[PDB]
Symmetry: C4
Subunit: 251 residues, 4 copies
Amino acid sequence: GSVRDRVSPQEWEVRVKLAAAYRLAALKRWTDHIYTHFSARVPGPDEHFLINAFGLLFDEITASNLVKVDIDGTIVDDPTGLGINYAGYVIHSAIHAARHDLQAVLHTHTRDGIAVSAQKDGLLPISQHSIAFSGRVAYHGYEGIALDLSERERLVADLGDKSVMILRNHGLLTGGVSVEHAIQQLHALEYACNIQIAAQSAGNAELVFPPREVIAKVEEQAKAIGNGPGVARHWNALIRELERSGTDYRD
Amino acid sequence: GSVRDRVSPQEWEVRVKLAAAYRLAALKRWTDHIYTHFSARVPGPDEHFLINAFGLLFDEITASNLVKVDIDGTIVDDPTGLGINYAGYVIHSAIHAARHDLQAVLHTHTRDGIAVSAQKDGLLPISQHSIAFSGRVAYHGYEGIALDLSERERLVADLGDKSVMILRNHGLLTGGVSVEHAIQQLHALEYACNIQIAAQSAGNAELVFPPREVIAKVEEQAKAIGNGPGVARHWNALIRELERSGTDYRD
Amino acid sequence: GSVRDRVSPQEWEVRVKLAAAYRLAALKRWTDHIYTHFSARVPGPDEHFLINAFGLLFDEITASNLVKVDIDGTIVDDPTGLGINYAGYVIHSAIHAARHDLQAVLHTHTRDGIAVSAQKDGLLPISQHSIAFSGRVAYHGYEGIALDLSERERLVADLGDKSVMILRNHGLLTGGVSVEHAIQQLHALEYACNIQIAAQSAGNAELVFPPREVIAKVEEQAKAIGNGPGVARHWNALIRELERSGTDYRD
Amino acid sequence: GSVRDRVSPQEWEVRVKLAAAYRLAALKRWTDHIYTHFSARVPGPDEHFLINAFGLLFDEITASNLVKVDIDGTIVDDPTGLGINYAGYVIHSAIHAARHDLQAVLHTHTRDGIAVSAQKDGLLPISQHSIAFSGRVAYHGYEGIALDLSERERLVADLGDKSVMILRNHGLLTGGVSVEHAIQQLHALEYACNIQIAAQSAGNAELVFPPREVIAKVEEQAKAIGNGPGVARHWNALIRELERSGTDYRD
């Protein structure tokens, strides 16, 4: 294992975690073929980041084949020779630069995530799962495929201090203080969206909205919560489940 | 097998049944990662109960690794050293204490169960499967994640004499005189919800509601029915299907 | 193989075909656990019929374990000792007695079949798949679980000369001049329903209804069609696909 | 391998590609049993085309068993002796004759493709995936199963210069300058439809439509795009994924 021989032990553990995140997304079917990306900061004094190689499926990602790039997307270490999807990295770059606290940035294009993205009122407070996101979610209006400077500014302004964003007509974005934290938020958000699409099948007018005070209570209940013990527990079970398919991801 | 060596044969058989119930829910995809729980009373002179260890997936549960707790959730026998989700057990505790007849209490967070939970009119009488629940279903208004004393009282009052409850905006709850009885009711309810979400895709106004007399007839037809021979038959087939994936659940 | 030793070669081939139909329904997920049933007439001078044993899953059915019953549901030959679901057989009995041309009667409780059943306008003419059923489909109003004499009469009157019925709020019924013919109609109907539930997700008012003449043309195009060469071709591919899972069904 | 011994290396590579396209559609569940078809032009001085043999599943198709036919559907080389679905080939023939640039023509009958087909406003501009098709999509009104001369003319007129068509109440059609190009467009269109059906579950009135300028921008962004490097990358990943199930398709 030549990659693990030359990188810091701290970089290696993040390579393993980010690769597991790619494979988990594949297992949970949060994928859109070769498009969309998960990034993580390499711990250390350098503004370096890990992302998938250009054209590999989430299913193929390993600790060893992730690509290390700088804030601009310039290859620092590409064990594949495939490089990266330079245009797909811009959103990751914009967020990582603006928010040094976010060590991981996930973006997905799932059926139900995009579906919720495409609705005026976005994510509704109609389930325990969605209500837990009350006051945690940023929205960003759709501006096209490429993220120009004008939009990059608005994207950061829209996110503000939050770590979950719905990219309207586009999909979902989650940040975290770790890969584990980002993935826990993404997993929960994706489920909240699954449930919304079913719930609303007869129209939003059939929905029961719990009272504002109840929403507020759940907000307080969830406000006690990315370095908490609940993150590690959730993640460790995902890992045990993943390993059930073999351990290639961490080579 | 050290667990089976020290527990009563009656406790052991309930450990096996409750473990099968966890694995069946995993097979049928009634799961929400590591959240939600199934409990059973340990037969005997002690108010002791079995539940999953904190952080294990339904897929991992075995007769040997279930945790035995008292009515408060205090460990009596924890073969895993993981303890339990103390806060998740409160609903089980509230119901078991109030209703000594219910030997099993199941709670789920499925896509379609929560979806039906989230609708004003809840479960509609529009299919044989849903109509069979007519007059069997309690509703409980959503009050947040943690179940405080004020809500615990209302939860018991809402359930009354029934053994099926829709926890609005939250999910489904089933009780039974046995694990088998509880699981049969849950299986049927979950299917009734699947069917409702499809049925109503063009709006509730497109639905055919059979006449009241017909609903009443089905109520009488189902009123002949948790110690009946139909429970054992349904359960024994679930077991044969489960065993098709291996017999680890009963170790 | 003791069953095959004592039955006519003509009975044996229908046992094989009906068992394949049970397993195919399981493969295609047209099942409702241990409920619902497929029946076939045993060719010969006796009014005898084959059906699943009480409590077996569709997945478990074999040529050897099907049960032979008379028009009343009395066991003639039960290789399992499990008998039959006597109450579930009544619908099969009512139709087989009334329509000697129908050598097979299938009844299902699928998510989308029941969903379409539950709607005022039933199956809409909005896809090639649904339009092909125009003028082929009977409807029967829901009257409860048990089929009493009053309802048995109406069921036969409702079906009339047709061989496809939507049992409102209940599910789907298909007949055929053979198991192959019945299964082809059921497969097509189930797909037409899948498509309808998706199509109508924004309401029936968003639907494009092709002109009446076009519907009429498709009716004529499908009117050329249960002993045609298209039935055998469709069935033979289902069999090849089934055999991909092993050949236990025909033992 | 007798087929590969007698055909040009250029024909052989298209046989391999078209077979992979059939198996991929099976893997991605874009199938309707034995109905629907993918065609490709055989490179060379002859107006010859490849299509599946009559009655084989997409899952069974191999480079060796594809059938070579002329523009009329007359067998030129049928390694199976099964011939072709002559009536199913007419749409392929009509398009291939009219548009010599299209080396591949795909037609599908998927749940969500037909569903979108069945709606007045067809494919809505409410997601990145659908907006990318803005101004690329032809519509053709439904006229029945058989494609007569009057309809053949209208079908070609409706398609015009485009290479993507929604066959209203019927399903989807994609063309391409290669099998790879056609498949990339089909994959994207099918996903756009999946997302639309979810998005619109509470009605089209809940949808956010990005402004016209934003749609226009995406049109320009996608207008840079069937011989581009993005086609090969998308296709090569599909192939790697397919090969994960074995390499029978290319024998």
